[PDB]
Design a protein around this ligand. Structure first.
Ligand code: NA
Ligand code: NA
Ligand code: NA
Length: 116
């Protein structure tokens, strides 16, 4: 479990962030609570500001939605930095533009995250 941690992309250095409309992206660190995330212990990754759950689909889109208990909202954190969706098996990824998505694991640094 974790409370109010940042989730930083190892490659870009940008932080996972989201808004009340459910958009997810990365931005440079700004100290705000939209850039913090909380993991209760049920596999969810909840935005500390909005309370919405990180979610994704088989096409690789990522977004936040009200927490609904489903497997698309459950994530596995690996000690090597992967963040894997339980339903799809795809891992969280992002780019220098700030887009966030999921892709099959390919060992790249864009799929490594530092959570703390
Ligand atoms: Na973050
Ligand atoms: Na979640
Ligand atoms: Na990942």
């Amino acid at each position: 479990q974790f409370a109010s941690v940042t989730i930083r992309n190892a490659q870009t250095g940008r932080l996972l962030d989201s808004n009340y409309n459910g958009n997810v992206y990365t931005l440079p660190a700004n100290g705000g609570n939209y850039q913090r995330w909380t993991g209760p212990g049920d596999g969810t990754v909840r935005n500390a500001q909005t309370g919405r759950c990180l979610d994704s689909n088989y096409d690789g889109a990522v977004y936040t939605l009200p927490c609904n208990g489903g497997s698309y909202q459950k994530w596995l954190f690996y000690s090597n930095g992967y963040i894997q969706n339980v339903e799809t098996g795809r891992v969280l990824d992002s780019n220098y533009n700030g887009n966030v998505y999921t892709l099959p694991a390919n060992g790249g640094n864009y799929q490594k995250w530092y959570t703390g």
